[PDB]
């Protein structure tokens, strides 16, 4: 196994949200087959970021997934050469982003490059006006269409008010190595949390627990 039980983590991030131009970097440790990472993030240009921190943060690695013997891991088998994936996050006041990162491992470390375009976010609305407080627990859905591994997720951020604001998460995972197998349908659950922050979200300690399963207990 290449995939060692500590890896480390280094990460960049470019992007616009709605004109909003901004760059972060990241430096993290996780488990990889315990499904557990965090991490520190730094906004290194074009901060305060002028929009919710929380549509970010799921583009700051399914490698970090516990997952049982009976489902094939292609994330685990992705690795040395690595891997990348390519996410459309529609919010259901019209606001759509694409965010894709290429993964790759050198020694202890996963270095991601990672890019995050939003646009079409109502100056009012909930993302604008930073109204966000985090995102719901929610279950990813793996399977195949069209020889592509795809997740589906339908979650939610919960807002200032006791209201939720409904996001529908499409990705497309695809191996660098030809010939890695594709697994069969399965669940990830993930849970994903701000553990700390400072006044703007400049510096923000971000954490994720992912567990796949096949539906049943």
Known sequence: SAIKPDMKIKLRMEGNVNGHHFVIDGDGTGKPFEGKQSMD?????????????????????????????????????????????????????????????????????????????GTNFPANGPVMQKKTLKWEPATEKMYVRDGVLTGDVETALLLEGNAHYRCDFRTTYKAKEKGVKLPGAHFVDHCIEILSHDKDYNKVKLYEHAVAHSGLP
């Open 41 to 117: 993030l730094e906004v290194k240009e074009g901060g305060p970021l002028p929009f919710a921190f929380d549509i970010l943060t799921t583009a700051f690695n399914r490698v970090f997934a516990k997952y049982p013997d009976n489902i094939q891991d292609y994330f685990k088998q992705s690795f040395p050469k690595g891997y990348s994936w390519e996410r459309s996050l529609t919010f259901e006041d019209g606001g759509i982003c694409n965010a894709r990162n290429d993964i790759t491992m050198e020694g202890d470390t996963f270095y991601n490059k990672v890019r995050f375009y």
